[PDB]
Design a protein around this ligand. Structure first.
Ligand code: ADP
Lengths: 319, 313, 426, 313
């Protein structure tokens, strides 16, 4: 019974073991494309982002460097759990905002978000809620004191109104940091301020048509929250369902949440089973914890079987 | 031979290595034959120069130890590292005794006067703190520099201390009057190393041209002899191709030993104004040197994580 | 000529600078052959007639002209010994101004940068031939009295960092005005009087680093013009500040030993000290209109200042920085097949290129095609945002981070899977 | 004391724990006071033997690493595992350098002869590949073994290469002429480990009964020393009660240290051929040992997930 239950995992584990040798060779090209996208394609819109990615892919193909061409440039960088957390924290479900959240999570220079819609501001507020984030503006009188407090205390900060840029942030954004042994010290204006390692700053914009000086363009990373055809189509379709077919819309939302939870629990199954069978520390035939793993596997086989009817009812609702 | 004519000769006697980081300072032990080195990995390794073998490793610091110094008896060792700590060690047990805190920034050097009851230290907080060894307390703090102080050093009787700092000045401070005696500024670039005249060289400098005489080497590839009393330089010695990091006298009181960042060790005679020998020390920058009072041995630390022993012939 | 670029003005001032450059290059050297004389003539010629140029074609024309003029006027000479590729001169490796080679210069500069990271700026730097040439040019300007600089280059190219490194290693003290909002001409004049007091009365070297973005009024540029041209700003010290300056200047003259009284000779000595001690480095971005505007509104910036055109990083610079940053990571495939189309974007690429060479060339292509896409988007009609070498450094750092992260995840998952299959086989 | 009589004494000096899996091979660094350990959980942990503190781990392998090796420079790390690959590591950045392929079976031994230019690799595929350092490509290939090759070790001069397999023979080869200069069939069981006689041991073996000499330890209840000049067994060491696993020579070239599966660290001699000190080491079987050339430290590697260091007096 154990082997019959675990053959379903063996038949794919051996396949992935064989695939790993090929997957070792695509790492360089795939990471090259991913890094170029995540450091270069921030300000541009969807069409220009796709044009740049196509140009880079064509050059890698012409240079005989193998890259995984059957993966999504956002699925390669994002995990399912962090995608679920972002979708919970008011992020739009389109690939553009998913890439923007990828760049916000994996930033190297401090990002400059441009959200005319105001979605990125509330997304950042919801995401950095456990850490005490504080909203402030460059035009606010209590900006220097708030920046000093955030720098001293290691609290994330979001600065709106970057059009009126206040140039005291040049050492912070350039990371001109003096290391006092193990201590970290940075100058700011007329004072030397202890820079805590767990400090991040986001600069915000509510106007797409703002011209920035090249020094700021070098110092910050642009994250453009534009609007795309697929996103607007999905938003309008959801609003039409909410207004006209409320029962259909609410059961669609409930089924989408249930499908997400079911996929999360299936991934939890896979991780738990792999880590439990990894650390048996002996013969699997001579233990009862293996029987506990078998019971977990059969219960989760039952739930992954019951996911199919949810898929069917989602299919009828979407058609 | 005669300690008057002790001069190192190529090649080195031993090539001692084992540090994981560049070596900052090397000094000799006065009583028992120990050469102890300080490095950038918080390891103060103890070596034996008589037979050229590794002896022991003393790890008490958490960041790069900068300078080490002894007392009149040689049984007490002090060290200073980038983690704002001064540590006093013994050699009867090779055990750390008392840690010393109170400086704001990187402590740059420490020194113990021959009376042995007090220890001075210069740091990056532009101050020299007057400590005491008995209870680990700061007696008072010298103040008056403008920038980071490179190292501090007392005279023979422990009443005049001098210090070199990044502001192109070398200030002599009186331990008695607690006031700067004669601050002189003549080097164009940062001064890095200083030294004092020994008891058996006043006649030598007087013939080459009382006292007291103060040495000072800087990063402008020059070495200057200064008289503390007159507040004026005697002369400027040139010849180094890069930054000078250490200057020291000789047992006979007639020679000047100095190492620089030009990957050479140079020993000079100041009577006839010129360099007399240029010894290729390392393959990288030479950080420091020390000269044995009673033995013909010279130790020179460096950045390439090696300590070399030269025999004075 | 001046219609090609506004700063392309030539005068016997450059011949005088050439003559004196050769003079202090031959002053303490005391034993040189004609090969060395031609070499220093060529080096000063390059430093005076090539720094202000914009286009690599013009730079190649200058190099060819130096070679052919030296050949024409100096027959039966050793061309290879006289002129070569690096032609670098330095005074860091020896007390005298002697020629140096790139390898020893790079080793010394890397060691000095290791020393420099601890003291002022703990930001890593990558070395290449343009950086070596730039730090030597900035050092050469900083050594001479009244040495002022005008660095022309795109933002994020490292102009102020190279200036800071050279200033630190030459004993200069770096000063920046720390501009912010509501920063007015009165605050600028207070900063100017503080730096002038420090440079004249206190007798210290100051590298007054300042930027075009730090200029907020025409009074800023007027004061800078007067200070650059004359070494003094009349009307800056008024009221009790004039009396304070006179007291401090008399104290400084007493400290340095010179006996001074009255006010006229004291102020002249203060002007001489400011001339001998204060260096101004001015950094802006290249522009067709802004450069002409600065030439009109401040002739001192184009007369009394030595102009260096950094520009954008070249493809050779991008290739070398990418290769040096991507050297610690595993990138070599022994079974690599070179494509016969050979898309190459960096000339003098090794043939046949290996895998790491090919992908660093690919990174250079990625930067180049972003340049082209930005130009196309600007020409279409939409708004554009300037691209900088900071973006290339960000891209190469993201490449390193993503490579290490994905490799670690893949190896961990493969190890877990292998142990799981071994246990199920058991 | 003199290093000619450095035997470990009970109890152990440091008991280092932290390994999840059996430990395979343990070696000492040439210049740094640090040492690495290879275990079965696809990790290479590094420990400071002087103070017994954990430094870091090196995880880049996906299967159990079998053998590790240094060079004379002390900058490049070799490691062979069961994942059909060998991996190079640098000691200044502590990162992977090159992943190499070419063996379709488990690789059990890896070493670098002191020129620092290429690597040997003994694997289960009845062959030994010659791979390069600066490139990572196969240039030469040994052929002639017909069973699993267990351990490969290059001679100190590097002109002779020695390999022992599971076919009751220890076939030594020539690196240049690709020829097995001495093959013999006298072992009764599988030979496990080999070692090379130093210059100091050359004269000792010559006066015991010129050179070079070789030693092999085999599962046939016998440990014997080989000679390449005559191709004959010069002596046989008997007295261990179980399967032998690790054996090595002393720094002075006069003593012998061995470990077996009876939880014993039995030191012997050639003049008298009896064990003067049998010492218990672990609770489980023992894998590997290492004795420092310039330090009195013996490290014990065993499958009991624990590595111990012993002090020699
Ligand atoms: N040669 C180089 N190698 C590596 N990094 C560099 C180099 N030059 C510049 N950088 C990076 O680029 C940044 C440039 O900052 P800065 O000099 O203030 O910009 P600007 O050149 O506009 O003044 C620095 O923070 C530095 O980290």
């Amino acid at each position: 019974a154990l082997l019959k239950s675990l053959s379903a995992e063996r038949e794919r584990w051996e396949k992935t073991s064989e695939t790993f040798k090929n997957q070792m060779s695509t790492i360089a090209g795939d990471c090259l494309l991913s890094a170029a996208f995540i450091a270069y394609a921030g300000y541009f819109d969807q069409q220009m982002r796709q044009n740049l990615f196509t140009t880079w892919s064509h050059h890698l193909q012409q240079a005989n460097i193998q890259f995984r061409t059957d993966i999504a440039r956002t699925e390669y960088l994002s995990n399912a759990d962090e995608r679920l957390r972002w979708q919970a924290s008011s992020l739009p479900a389109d690939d553009l905002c998913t890439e923007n959240a990828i760049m916000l999570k994996r930033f190297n220079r401090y990002p400059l978000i441009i959200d005319p819609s105001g979605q990125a501001t509330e997304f950042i507020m919801n995401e950095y809620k456990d850490r005490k984030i504080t909203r402030t503006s460059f035009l606010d009188d209590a900006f220097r004191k708030n920046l000093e407090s955030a720098l001293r205390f290691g609290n994330p900060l979001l600065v709106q109104d970057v059009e009126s840029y206040d140039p005291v942030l040049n050492p912070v954004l350039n990371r001109e940091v003096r290391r006092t042994g193990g201590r970290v010290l940075i100058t700011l204006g007329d004072q030397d301020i202890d820079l805590s390692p767990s400090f991040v700053i986001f600069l915000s914009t509510r106007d797409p048509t703002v011209e920035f000086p090249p020094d700021l363009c070098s110092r910050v990373t642009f994250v453009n929250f534009t609007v795309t055809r697929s996103s607007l189509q999905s938003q309008c379709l959801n609003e039409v369902l909410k207004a006209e077919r409320p029962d259909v819309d609410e059961k669609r939302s409930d089924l989408l949440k249930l499908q997400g939870e079911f996929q999360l629990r299936l991934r939890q199954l896979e991780k738990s089973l792999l880590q439990a069978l990894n650390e048996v520390k002996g013969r699997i035939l001579d233990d009862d914890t293996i029987i506990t793993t078998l019971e977990n596997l059969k219960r989760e086989a039952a739930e992954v079987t019951r996911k199919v009817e949810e898929t069917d009812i989602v299919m009828q609702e979407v058609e | 031979r005669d300690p008057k004519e002790w001069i190192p000769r190529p090649p080195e006697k031993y090539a001692l290595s084992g540090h994981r980081s560049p070596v900052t300072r090397v000094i000799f032990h006065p009583v028992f034959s120990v050469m102890v080195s300080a490095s950038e990995d918080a390891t103060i390794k103890v070596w034996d120069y008589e037979t050229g073998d590794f002896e022991r490793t003393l790890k008490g610091h958490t960041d790069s130890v900068q300078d080490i110094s002894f007392d009149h008896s040689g049984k007490l060792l002090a060290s200073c590292s980038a983690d704002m700590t001064i540590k006093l060690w013994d050699f009867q047990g090779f055990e750390c005794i008392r840690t010393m805190h109170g400086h704001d920034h990187n402590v740059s050097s420490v020194a113990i006067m021959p009376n042995g009851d007090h220890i001075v230290s210069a740091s990056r907080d532009k101050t020299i703190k007057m400590w005491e060894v008995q209870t680990g307390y700061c007696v008072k703090t010298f103040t008056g520099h403008r920038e980071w102080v490179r190292m501090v050093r007392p005279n023979q009787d422990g009443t005049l201390i001098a210090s070199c700092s990044n502001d192109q000045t070398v200030r002599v401070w009186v331990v008695a009057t607690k006031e700067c005696k004669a601050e002189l500024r003549e080097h164009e670039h940062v001064v890095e190393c200083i030294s004092w005249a020994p008891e058996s060289s006043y006649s030598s400098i007087s013939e080459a041209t009382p006292g007291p005489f103060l040495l000072s080497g800087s990063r402008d590839k020059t070495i200057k002899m200064w008289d503390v009393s007159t507040g004026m330089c005697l002369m400027t010695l040139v010849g180094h191709d890069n930054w000078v990091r250490g200057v020291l006298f000789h047992s006979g009181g007639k020679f000047i030993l100095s190492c620089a960042d030009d990957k050479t060790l140079r020993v000079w005679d100041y009577k006839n104004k010129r360099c007399m020998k240029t010894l290729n020390a390392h393959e990288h920058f030479v950080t420091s040197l020390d000269f044995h009072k009673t033995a013909p041995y010279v130790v020179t630390g460096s950045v390439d994580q090696t300590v070399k022993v030269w025999e004075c012939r | 000529t001046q219609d090609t670029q506004p700063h392309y003005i030539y005068s016997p001032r450059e011949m005088t600078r050439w003559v004196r450059g050769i003079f202090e290059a031959l002053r303490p050297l005391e034993t040189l052959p004609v090969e060395g004389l031609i070499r220093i003539w060529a080096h000063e010629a390059l430093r005076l007639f090539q720094d202000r140029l914009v286009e690599d074609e013009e730079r190649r024309w200058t190099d060819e002209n130096i070679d052919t003029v030296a050949l024409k006027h100096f027959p039966n000479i050793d061309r290879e010994k006289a002129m070569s590729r690096p032609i670098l001169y330095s005074n860091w490796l020896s007390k005298d101004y002697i020629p140096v080679d790139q390898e020893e210069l790079r080793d010394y500069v890397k060691a000095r940068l290791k020393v420099f990271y601890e003291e002022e700026l703990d930001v890593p730097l990558v070395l290449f031939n343009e950086v070596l040439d730039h730090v030597l040019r900035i050092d050469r300007i900083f050594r001479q009295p009244q040495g002022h600089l005008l660095l022309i280059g795109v933002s994020g190219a490292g102009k102020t960092t190279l200036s800071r490194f050279v200033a630190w290693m030459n004993g200069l003290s770096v000063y920046q005005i720390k501009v912010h909002r509501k920063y007015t001409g009165e605050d600028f004049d207070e900063d100017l009087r503080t730096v002038l007091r420090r440079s004249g009365c206190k007798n210290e070297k100051i590298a007054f680093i300042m930027d075009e973005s730090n200029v907020l009024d025409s009074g800023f540029l007027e004061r800078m013009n007067t200070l650059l041209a004359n070494g003094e700003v009349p009307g800056l010290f008024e009221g009790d500040e004039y009396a304070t300056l006179m007291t401090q200047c008399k104290e400084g003259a007493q400290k340095e030993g010179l006996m001074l009284d009255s006010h006229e000779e004291l102020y002249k000595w203060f002007t001489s000290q400011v001339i001998r001690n204060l260096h101004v480095v001015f950094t802006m971005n290249p522009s067709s209109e802004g450069l002409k505007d600065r030439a009109a509104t401040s002739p001192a910036l184009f007369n009394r200042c030595v102009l260096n055109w950094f520009g954008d990083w070249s493809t050779e610079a991008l290739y070398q920085v990418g290769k040096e940053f991507t050297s610690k990571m595993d990138l070599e495939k022994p079974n690599y097949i070179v494509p016969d189309y050979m898309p190459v974007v960096y000339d003098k690429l090794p043939q046949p290129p290996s895998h790491r060479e090919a992908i660093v060339n690919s990174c250079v292509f990625v930067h180049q095609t972003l340049h082209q896409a930005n130009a196309r988007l600007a020409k279409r009609g939409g708004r554009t945002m300037a691209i900088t070498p900071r973006h290339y450094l960000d891209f190469i750092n993201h490449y390193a981070n993503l490579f290490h992260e994905k490799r670690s995840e893949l190896e961990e998952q493969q190890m877990h899977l292998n142990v799981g299959l071994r246990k199920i086989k058991e």
